[PDB]
Write a protein that binds this ligand. Sequence first.
Ligand code: NAG
Length: 326
Amino acid sequence: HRIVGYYQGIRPLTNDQAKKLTHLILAFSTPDSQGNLSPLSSVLKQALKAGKSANGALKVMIAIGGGGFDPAIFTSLASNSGTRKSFINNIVSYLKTNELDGCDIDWEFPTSSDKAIFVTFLRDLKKAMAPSGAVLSMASAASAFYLDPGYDLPGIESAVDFINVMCYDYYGSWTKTSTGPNSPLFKGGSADPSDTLNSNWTMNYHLMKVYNRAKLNMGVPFYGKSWTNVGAPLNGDGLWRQLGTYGTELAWRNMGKSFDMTKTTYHKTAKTAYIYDTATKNFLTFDNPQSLKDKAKYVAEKGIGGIMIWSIDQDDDKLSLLNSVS
Ligand SMILES: *[C@@H]1O[C@H](CO)[C@@H](O)[C@H](O)[C@H]1NC(C)=O
């Protein structure tokens, strides 16, 4: 159903890409301490024009905030009814001025002190957006650690048109235990030390809280993560290996020129792709056409309302990943 594509201006949005999306979410605009939104960058502006020109049905939205963005500023703007009201008016004015069709609130992350005020902010923002038909979404966290204290999912659901669930970054630069999958679909069987660092657990968490699952999008990544100097498996399964050193996040479009993709191992239980290169001891966890196909099937099977992608511009020139997901 929905194909919600985040876009961060790595490269121009192509006319083929625009036709494969229902929603294009430019990323990012950030508010200052007074609720003034940063102006749309040139690369984001171009993608808006390219998307609308190539797909008259496409909704082009601005994601406000982001993983880099200080969540205490969201707290400040939303907690005060006066600043909440003016921030909302600034958002609505920003949409009209920049010819946008709506916005995504990417607040990473609301704390327990934010839980109710986040819902109030989204409900009020929806009310101001409703006459123009502007589309409202938010990005949701992937673990109970964040979800339980900070996310009133029923309340959020009552306000937004859909929820973009960030089912990725399950392992990363903070991981001290072992290598592991950035975005597996499932727990990876008996060798998996975790029940929850997978998309299925995160989506099931949301399914158990929200009224209408059609309002959920399962997020998928078009990027992967690498480690170097990686050693032996911890418990007989090559996905979880003795740590060397965190590498970086790589866009899919850049993996094939640095890794021999013919060495891809596809985990049959977790539904996730990785490469361990015994020659170099480099390790890459990523998503590829196979993992994305399995995830689209999961979404259809569970009746989830859509797929969201971070980020479509990380795809290769031939749209291997976007063509696989839809
Ligand atoms: C997905 O998660 C649910 C609930 O956590 C669990 O019952 C189910 O077995 C999981 N599916 C797979 C294939 O791991």
